[PDB]
Amino acid sequence: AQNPNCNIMIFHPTKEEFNDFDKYIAYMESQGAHRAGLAKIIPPKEWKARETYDNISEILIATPLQQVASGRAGVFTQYHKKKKAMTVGEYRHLANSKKYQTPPHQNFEDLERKYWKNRIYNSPIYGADISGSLFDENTKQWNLGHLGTIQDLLEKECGVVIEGVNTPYLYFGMWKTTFAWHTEDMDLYSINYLHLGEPKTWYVVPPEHGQRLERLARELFPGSSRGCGAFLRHKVALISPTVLKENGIPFNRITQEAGEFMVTFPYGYHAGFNHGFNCAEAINFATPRWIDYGKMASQCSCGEARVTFSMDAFVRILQPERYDLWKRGQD
Ligand SMILES: O=C(O)CNC(=O)C(=O)O
Ligand SMILES: [Mg+2]
Ligand code: NI
Ligand SMILES: [Zn+2]
Numbered sequence: 001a002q003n004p005n006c007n008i009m010i011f012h013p014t015k016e017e018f019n020d021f022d023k024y025i026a027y028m029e030s031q032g033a034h035r036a037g038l039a040k041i042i043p044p045k046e047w048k049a050r051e052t053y054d055n056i057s058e059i060l061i062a063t064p065l066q067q068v069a070s071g072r073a074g075v076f077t078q079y080h081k082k083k084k085a086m087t088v089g090e091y092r093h094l095a096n097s098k099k100y101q102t103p104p105h106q107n108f109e110d111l112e113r114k115y116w117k118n119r120i121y122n123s124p125i126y127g128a129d130i131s132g133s134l135f136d137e138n139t140k141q142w143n144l145g146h147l148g149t150i151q152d153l154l155e156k157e158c159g160v161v162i163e164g165v166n167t168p169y170l171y172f173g174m175w176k177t178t179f180a181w182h183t184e185d186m187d188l189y190s191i192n193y194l195h196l197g198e199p200k201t202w203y204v205v206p207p208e209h210g211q212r213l214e215r216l217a218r219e220l221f222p223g224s225s226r227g228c229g230a231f232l233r234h235k236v237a238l239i240s241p242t243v244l245k246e247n248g249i250p251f252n253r254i255t256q257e258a259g260e261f262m263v264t265f266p267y268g269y270h271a272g273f274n275h276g277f278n279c280a281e282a283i284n285f286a287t288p289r290w291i292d293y294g295k296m297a298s299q300c301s302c303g304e305a306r307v308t309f310s311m312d313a314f315v316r317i318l319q320p321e322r323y324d325l326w327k328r329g330q331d
Pocket of ligand 4: 228302303304
């Protein structure tokens with residue numbers, strides 16, 4: 001069995017290997033990459049996402065979110081407070097302000113220490129889930145707006161034709177902006193490209209060990225767990241690496257820098273934080289190997305998780321028994 005310790009693998013495809021996206025995912029899996037839950041892909045030196053980032057300041061962040069924490073430094077939740085609209089240029093100036101900018105630090109490890117010590121005492125502002133793309137239309141390789149769609153994958157594998165669409169989303173981050181522990185909707189894959197700016201640190205639990213993380217989370221967030229049998233779908237809970245180590249949870253960590261892709265694999269729990277002002281693009285995708293995970297994915301039906309239109313079909317076709325309850329949670 002390849003990669004039996006479930007380490008995060010880093011790939012360096014050639015320009016020729018960069019042509020066929022599906023083939024390369026399947027290659028990474030042949031080498032055991034999925035066992036980690038996360039892989040990094042460094043694009044060939046000849047590749048670029050677009051020519052420059054000099055003209056992005058007028059993108060609008062219609063609903064910036066202030067991430068307010070509650071709990072203790074290593075075990076906390078966050079809620080998202082809506083803020084007034086602002087442009088990317090206004091958000092960048094805010095991220096760089098004395099109140100929000102990255103502190104002086106020695107290296108990524110020092111900054112990680114500072115994040116986990118001090119995150120809860122601040123409320124950074126995040127642009128999230130902004131439909132759109134920064135890939136040039138002429139970029140043919142690994143263009144996250146030109147991927148094969150999940151609806152087409154389901155039709156190819158299963159024969160069933162369904163409604164829905166699959167488009168990318170932009171994220172604008174600053175120091176301490178945080179992504180809570182989660183798997184993707186319907187335990188899909190994700191791909192994330194860091195277009196510009198400062199790094200993103202990721203933590204990940206191997207898919208084969210995800211239920212260990214879920215059991216710890218039920219222990220650490222006991223009221224949330226009573227409220228919902230899939231409360232990690234709410235995407236609000238944080239647990240530090242120190243707490244995961246104290247509790248014996250298998251995990252790995254890696255830092256993504258600008259110009260790098262990350263792929264998350266089905267049922268790979270992940271969480272992390274941004275180092276400073278940045279812009280990322282991400283989208284969910286499927287392969288044939290996903291189908292079995294989609295059929296088994298947990299679902300939130302308490303009303304909190306509320307998700308896209310296109311997840312309806314996935315539940316309806318893959319999880320007909322759960323469909324009525326889950327749709328009630330949507331309405
Ligand atoms: O850009 C981001 O914060 C969030 N990304 C993820 O959790 C992902 O791509 O799967
Ligand atoms: Mg612009
Ligand atoms: Ni994710
Ligand atoms: Zn719920």
